[PDB]
Design a protein around this ligand. Structure first.
Ligand SMILES: CCCCCCCC/C=C\CCCCCCCC(=O)O[C@@H](COC(=O)CCCCCCCCCCCCCCC)COP(=O)([O-])OCC[N+](C)(C)C
Ligand SMILES: CCCCCCCC/C=C\CCCCCCCC(=O)O[C@@H](COC(=O)CCCCCCCCCCCCCCC)COP(=O)([O-])OCC[N+](C)(C)C
Ligand SMILES: CCCCCCCC/C=C\CCCCCCCC(=O)O[C@@H](COC(=O)CCCCCCCCCCCCCCC)COP(=O)([O-])OCC[N+](C)(C)C
Ligand SMILES: CCCCCCCC/C=C\CCCCCCCC(=O)O[C@@H](COC(=O)CCCCCCCCCCCCCCC)COP(=O)([O-])OCC[N+](C)(C)C
Ligand SMILES: CCCCCCCC/C=C\CCCCCCCC(=O)O[C@@H](COC(=O)CCCCCCCCCCCCCCC)COP(=O)([O-])OCC[N+](C)(C)C
Ligand SMILES: CCCCCCCC/C=C\CCCCCCCC(=O)O[C@@H](COC(=O)CCCCCCCCCCCCCCC)COP(=O)([O-])OCC[N+](C)(C)C
Ligand SMILES: CC(C)CCC[C@@H](C)[C@H]1CC[C@H]2[C@@H]3CC=C4C[C@@H](O)CC[C@]4(C)[C@H]3CC[C@]12C
Ligand SMILES: CC(C)CCC[C@@H](C)[C@H]1CC[C@H]2[C@@H]3CC=C4C[C@@H](O)CC[C@]4(C)[C@H]3CC[C@]12C
Ligand SMILES: CC(C)CCC[C@@H](C)[C@H]1CC[C@H]2[C@@H]3CC=C4C[C@@H](O)CC[C@]4(C)[C@H]3CC[C@]12C
Ligand SMILES: CC(C)CCC[C@@H](C)[C@H]1CC[C@H]2[C@@H]3CC=C4C[C@@H](O)CC[C@]4(C)[C@H]3CC[C@]12C
Ligand SMILES: CC(C)CCC[C@@H](C)[C@H]1CC[C@H]2[C@@H]3CC=C4C[C@@H](O)CC[C@]4(C)[C@H]3CC[C@]12C
Ligand SMILES: CC(C)CCC[C@@H](C)[C@H]1CC[C@H]2[C@@H]3CC=C4C[C@@H](O)CC[C@]4(C)[C@H]3CC[C@]12C
Lengths: 196, 196, 196, 196, 196, 196
C-alpha cells in the first residue's frame, strides 16, 4: 500500500486532470469521507430515539421527526458524495475500457468526456447544496421546534438532540462542498483556457 | 488495487460485452450497492421498533407491521441485487472454467451464454420491479396506516417511521432499477443487431 | 482479486469435479452465503426481543420462545452451511497435502475421496432438510402461537415478529438447499457413469 | 488467496506433522472457529439482559446470573481455543526463528518441541473439558433455576434464555473438543511409534 | 506487510523530513489513533443516554447535554486528527504527483511545501488545543453540573457519566497533542537552522 | 500471509533480540491481544447499564459507578498494551529509518536503543501493574459494593455485573503481564551478560 498506488487510484489515470483536480480534489474527497465516517453514527446515530416531544399523544414523535427532518444530514451528504463521485468512476471505467480495447488490437474524446464529467460533478454539487438550503435554511439547528401536524394536538414542543455538534459538522461539510465547487469551477476554466 | 484490476473484475472478462454493459451497468451496480449500504441500517434500521400503533392491546404492533410490511424495502432490494448479479457471476464462472479446461489441453457458446444471461438479468429486474409494485403501490409512504387485523380491535392507527426518507431512497432505487432495465434491453438489441 | 483466483479457490483444485460441481455448486454456495448474510441480523436480529406474549406472568416470554423456536432458522442454516462446506474443505486440504508431500520427494484415491465427499455433502444436506421439517413443519410461520408450558398459566397467546419476511427467506433457503441436493445427486451419478 | 497458502499457514511448516494433524486438526479448528463466530453474538448475545427472575428485589437478577453462570459458554470456549492454539503458534514461531537464524549463517530439537506442543495441546483440551464438566454438569440447560443467594429473599425462580439452542451448540462444541482430543492422542501415539 | 512499507507510507517519501518528524511524529500519530479507537465507543459511547438530570420536565436532558457538551471530546479529537493529518496527506499527494509528472518526461519548491505543511500542522494543533481550552476549561470533569436553560425550571442537577475515565483519556490526548506541538516546533527550527 | 512475514513483522527486524524476546514475547503479546478482543465487548460491554443500585435517588447509579470503577479493566489493559507496544514500534521505526538513510548513501547505537526500549517496556509494565493494584486491590471482584457519595443518601448497595467472569479475565491478564515482566527482565539480563 504505497503512495503511488493510492495517488494513481484517486487520480483515475485519465492523463487530462491538472494539479487542482488530481492533488486537491482527491484530498477534499478524502476529508469529506473521513468526516462523514466519524460523524455518521456517533452524532446522528440517535437522532430519532433521543428526539422527544412534550406531548402525551402516541405517534406524535415520529410524525414530528419526519416533519422537521425529511432526510437527515448524514444521508443527504452520503447521497451527495455518491452522486459527486459517480462521474469520476464513469471516467475511470471509460479510460480502463479504452485501454482494454486498444490492448486487444482517442485523446479528444477522452478530453471531452473528462470536461463533461467535471461539469456534471459541479452541477451535482450545486444541486445538493441548493437542496440542503431548501430543506434546512440556515447553517444552525435549534433545540426547540414547534410542530402542529396530525395527530399532535395544537402545537407541541419537540427537542432536537445535539444541535450544536450537528451545527459544527454541518459547517464543516458545507465548507468542504464549497471548496469542491470552487475547485471544479477552477478546473473547468483552466481546461478551457488551455484548450484555446 | 488499480483501476484495470477493478474494471476486469467488474467486466467478467467475457470478451462479448459492449461499452453499455461493461462501463455503464457496472457503474449502476456500484451505485446501487453504495446506496443500499448507506441506507440499509441507518434508515431502515429501526423500522420495527420505532413503529408504534395507537392501541393498548398487546401484540398489535407486530401483526400490524407484518400486515403493512410483508418484506421491507431494503431486504427486497438486497434480494433483487443478489438475483440480478447471479447470472453475471455464472458467466464469470463459465468463462473461468473454459479458460481452465483449455489450459490443461467455443466463441458461439459463450456468446449464447452471455445473451441468455442478459435476458435473465432483465427478467429478474422486471420481476422484482413488478413485485415491488404489487406489495407497495406508489412510490411514496404515508405516516398513518389504518390496520384492522386480529388481535387489534376494530381499526387502529399505526405510525410509520421516516416515511419521507424512505420515499427518497425508494425513488433512487427505482430509478436505478429502471436504468438497469433500459441498459439491459439496449445491450440485447445491440448484440442482436451486431449478430445479423 | 481476479476471477481465475476466485474460481480456483472455490473449485478446490481437485481436478475431478465436472461443471455441475465446479461452476454451479459454487454459485449456489455463494448465493446461500449472501442471503444468510443479508437476512441473519436484519430479519432474525430481534426475534427474541420483539417476541411478546399476552400474559402478565414473569418469565413466560422466554419459555414460550424456547418452546416454539428450539433453534432459530438462521443458526440452523449456518450450521447446515458449515457442515456442508466441511467435506469440500477436507478435500481441499487433502489435495494440498498431497501436493506438498509429493513436492518433497494417487489419482484413484483422490477420486474416491472426492466421491465420498460429495456423498457426505448430500447426506448432510438431506439430514438438515429433514431436521428443518421436523422442527418447523410447513414452510410458513404464523403470527399467533398458543403456548401452554410452565410457568405460563393455561394457554397464552404469543406473537411472532415478521412471520412473512421469515417465510420468504425460508422459501429462498429451502429452494437453494433443494437445488444443492439435486446438483450433488447429479454429480454422483455423472461420476459413476464416467467411471464405468 | 490460494489453497496452498492457507494450507501452509495452518500446517505451521514444521515438517513433522502427519496427515492426522495437518489435514484433520486444522479442519476441526476451522470448524470450531466458525461455530464460535456464528454462535458468539447471536445466541449468547443477550444471556444477561433476557435473563430475568421472578422477584421484585433490586439486584437479584445480576447476583443470580453470576451465581449460575460464573463464566459463559462462549467465553470459556474462546479461552479454550486461544490456549489450545497457543502451542501451535509457539511451534510456528520457533520454526520461523530457526529458519531466520540459519539464514544469517536441529531436526531432533524440532521433533521434541512438536511432541511437547502436541502434549500440551492435549493437556489444555482435557483441562478445559474438565472445567466445563465442573461448572456445568450435563450437556443440557434448564429453563428454571432456583436461586437462594443474597440479596434475593428465600428462593427465587430465574429463567434462562434459549436453553435449547445453547444446548445444541454445547453439544457441537463438546463433540469438536472430543474429536480434537482423540486426534491429538492419535498423533502422539503415531509419532512415538514412528520414532521407535 | 513489512516494516519498510509501513515506514515509507507513514514518512510520505518527501525526502526532507528528519528523524524527529519521520520516526517520532508518526509514532505519536499512531498512539493517538489507537487511543481514540479504544476510547471512542467504549467510554464516550453512552455519553448521551447515561446522562440524566434530576428533573421531571420533558426535554431537559437533551438541552442540558447540549449546553454542557457543545461537541464531545472524541469528535473534537477526531476533527483535530483529520485536520492535523490533512497537510501531510497534501504533501504526500504533491510528491506523488511530482514523481508522476517527471515520469512522463524541484527540490526548493518541495522543501518550501514541506515547511509550510509543518507550519500549518502546528497551527492546527494550537488552534484545536485553544478550542478545547475554551469549551472545557480544566483537564477534569465533574459529576454534578448545574443547568439553568429553557425548558428546565430554575436550576437542575445533571449527572455526567464516567467523569474519571474521560478525565484520564483527556489527559492522555492532551499530552499527546502537546508532544506533537513540541515536535513540530523542533522540526521547524531544525529545518530553518539547516537551511542557514 | 506466510509465517515468515508475520514473524518478521513481530520481531521488528532489529537483529539484536534473542529467542526470549522474539519467539516468546510476541506470543504473549498475541495472547493478550486475543484475550482483550474476546473480553472487551462481551464481558465489559454492559458494565455501566447492568450496574444498578438499591436506591431511588436519580443520578446515584452514575456517581456510584464512577466511584468504584475510576477506569474499567478493559480500558486500563488497552492503555497498558498501547504503552508497552510503543517502544517496540519506536525501535522498528528507528531500524527502518536507519535502513532508509543508509540506502540513500551503527550497531552500538541500535543495541543501546534496543536495551533502553526493553527497559522502558519493563518500566511501563511495572507501572501499570502497580496502578492496577492501587485502583483495585486484590484480584477478585465482589457483587455488593457499599457506596456513600453525593447525591446518594447514607450508604446504598450497588450490584456489579459478572464479578466472577471479570475475576477470571483479570487473573488471565495479570498472569500474562507477570510473564511479560519476567521475560523482559530475563532479556535485559541476557543482553547485559552477553555484552560483558
Ligand atoms: C461497499 C463499501 C464501500 C465503502 C467506501 C469505500 C471508499 C474508498 C475506500 C477504499 C478503497 C481502497 C483504498 C485503499 C487503496 C490502496 C491501493 C494501493 O495502494 O494499491 C497498490 C497497492 O495495493 C496492494 O498491494 C493492496 C492494497 C489494498 C487496498 C485495500 C483493499 C481492500 C480493503 C478493504 C477495507 C474493508 C473496510 C472498508 C469499510 C467497510 C497497487 O499495487 P502496486 O504494488 O502499486 O502495483 C504494482 C506496482 N506498479 C504499478 C508500480 C508496477
Ligand atoms: C460476504 C459479504 C459480501 C459483500 C458484498 C461484496 C460486493 C463486492 C465487494 C467487494 C469485492 C472486491 C472489491 C475490490 C476488488 C479489487 C480487485 C483488484 O483491483 O484486483 C487487482 C489488485 O488486487 C490486489 O492486489 C488486492 C485487492 C484487494 C481487493 C479486496 C480484498 C478483500 C476486501 C475485503 C473487504 C472486507 C469488508 C467488506 C464488507 C463486509 C488484481 O491484481 P493486479 O496487480 O491487477 O494483478 C496482476 C496485474 N496484471 C493482471 C496486469 C498482470
Ligand atoms: C471467520 C469468518 C469467516 C467468514 C466466512 C468466509 C467465507 C468465504 C469468504 C471469503 C474468503 C476469501 C474470498 C476472496 C478470495 C479471493 C482470492 C483471489 O482472488 O486470490 C487471488 C488474488 O488474491 C489476492 O491478491 C488477494 C485477495 C484477497 C482476498 C481476501 C483476503 C481477506 C479478506 C478479509 C475480509 C474481511 C471481512 C470478512 C467478513 C467478516 C490469488 O492471487 P493471484 O494474483 O491470482 O496469484 C498469482 C497468479 N497466478 C496464480 C495465475 C500465477
Ligand atoms: C485480532 C483478531 C483475530 C481474529 C482471529 C483470526 C483467526 C484466523 C483468521 C485469519 C488469518 C488469515 C486467514 C487467511 C490466510 C490466507 C493466507 C494465504 O492464502 O496466503 C497466500 C496469499 O496471500 C495473499 O496474497 C493475501 C491473503 C490475505 C489473507 C487475509 C489478510 C487479512 C484479512 C483481515 C480480515 C479482517 C477481519 C477479521 C475478523 C475481524 C500467500 O501468498 P502466495 O501468493 O501464496 O505467496 C507466494 C507464492 N509461493 C509461496 C508459492 C511462492
Ligand atoms: C475510511 C476509514 C479510514 C480509517 C482510518 C485509516 C487510518 C490509517 C489506517 C490504515 C492504512 C493502512 C495501514 C497498513 C499499511 C501497510 C502498508 C504496507 O506494509 O505496504 C507494503 C505491503 O503491502 C501489502 O502487500 C498489503 C498491505 C495491506 C495494508 C492494509 C490494506 C487495507 C486494510 C483495510 C482495513 C479495514 C479496517 C480498517 C478500519 C475500518 C507495500 O508492499 P511491498 O511488498 O513493500 O511493495 C513492494 C516492495 N518494494 C517496494 C520494496 C519493492
Ligand atoms: C487502528 C486499529 C488497529 C487494531 C490493532 C492492530 C494490531 C495488529 C493487527 C494486525 C496487523 C497485521 C497482522 C497480519 C500481518 C501479516 C503480514 C504478512 O504476513 O506479510 C507478508 C504477506 O503479506 C501480504 O501479502 C499481505 C498480508 C496482509 C496482512 C493484513 C492486512 C490488513 C488487514 C486488515 C484487518 C482489518 C480488521 C482489523 C481489526 C479492526 C509479507 O509479504 P511477503 O510475500 O512475505 O513479502 C515478500 C516475500 N519476501 C519478503 C520473502 C521476499
Ligand atoms: C477526483 C476525485 C473525486 C477522485 C475520487 C475517486 C473515487 C470516485 C473512486 C476512487 C476509488 C473508487 C473505489 C474503488 C473500488 C471500489 C470497490 C467496489 O466494489 C465498489 C466501488 C469502490 C468503493 C470505488 C468507489 C469509487 C472510488 C472511491
Ligand atoms: C455487469 C455487472 C452486473 C457486473 C457485476 C459483477 C458482480 C456480479 C460480481 C463481480 C465481483 C463478484 C464478487 C467477487 C468475490 C466475492 C467473494 C465471495 O466469497 C462471495 C462472492 C463475491 C462477493 C462476488 C459476488 C459477485 C460479484 C460482485
Ligand atoms: C463446491 C463448493 C461447495 C466449494 C466451496 C468452498 C468452501 C467450502 C471453501 C472455499 C474457501 C474456504 C475459506 C478459505 C479461507 C478461510 C479462512 C480461515 O481462517 C477460516 C476458513 C475459511 C473462511 C475457508 C472456509 C471454507 C471455504 C469458504
Ligand atoms: C494444527 C492447528 C491447530 C493449527 C492452527 C494454527 C493457528 C494456531 C494459527 C495459524 C494462523 C495464526 C494467525 C496468523 C496471524 C495472526 C495475526 C496477529 O496479529 C494475531 C495472531 C493471528 C490471528 C494468528 C493466530 C494463530 C493462528 C490462527
Ligand atoms: C508524519 C505523520 C503525521 C504522517 C501521517 C500520515 C497520514 C496522514 C496518512 C498515511 C496513510 C494515509 C491513508 C492511506 C490510505 C487511505 C485510504 C483512503 O481511501 C482514505 C484515506 C486514507 C485512510 C489515508 C489517510 C491519511 C494517512 C493515514
Ligand atoms: C516483541 C513484541 C512486543 C512486538 C510487538 C510488535 C507491535 C508493537 C507492532 C507489530 C506490528 C505493528 C502494527 C503494524 C501496522 C499498523 C497499522 C497502522 O496504521 C497503525 C499501527 C499498526 C496497527 C501497528 C501497531 C504496532 C504493531 C502491532
Amino acid at each position: 500500500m504505497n503512495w503511488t498506488g493510492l495517488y494513481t487510484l484517486l487520480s483515475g489515470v485519465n492523463r487530462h486532470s491538472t494539479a487542482i483536480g488530481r492533488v486537491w480534489l482527491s484530498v477534499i474527497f478524502i476529508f469529506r469521507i473521513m468526516v462523514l465516517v466519524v460523524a455518521a453514527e456517533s452524532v446522528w446515530g440517535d437522532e430519532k430515539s433521543s428526539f422527544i416531544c412534550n406531548t402525551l399523544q402516541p405517534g406524535c414523535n415520529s410524525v414530528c421527526y419526519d416533519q422537521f427532518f425529511p432526510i437527515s444530514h448524514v444521508r443527504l451528504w452520503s447521497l451527495q458524495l455518491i452522486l459527486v463521485s459517480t462521474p469520476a468512476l464513469l471516467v475511470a471505467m471509460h479510460v480502463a475500457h479504452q485501454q482494454h480495447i486498444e490492448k486487444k488490437m482517442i485523446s479528444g474524446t477522452l478530453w471531452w468526456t473528462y470536461v463533461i464529467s467535471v461539469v456534471f460533478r459541479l452541477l451535482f454539487e450545486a444541486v445538493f447544496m441548493y437542496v440542503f438550503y431548501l430543506l434546512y435554511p440556515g447553517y444552525a439547528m435549534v433545540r426547540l421546534v414547534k410542530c402542529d401536524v396530525y395527530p399532535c394536538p395544537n402545537t407541541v414542543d419537540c427537542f432536537v438532540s445535539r444541535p450544536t455538534e450537528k451545527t459544527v459538522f454541518t459547517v464543516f461539510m458545507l465548507a468542504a462542498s464549497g471548496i469542491c465547487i470552487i475547485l471544479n469551477v477552477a478546473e473547468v476554466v483552466y481546461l478551457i483556457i488551455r484548450a484555446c
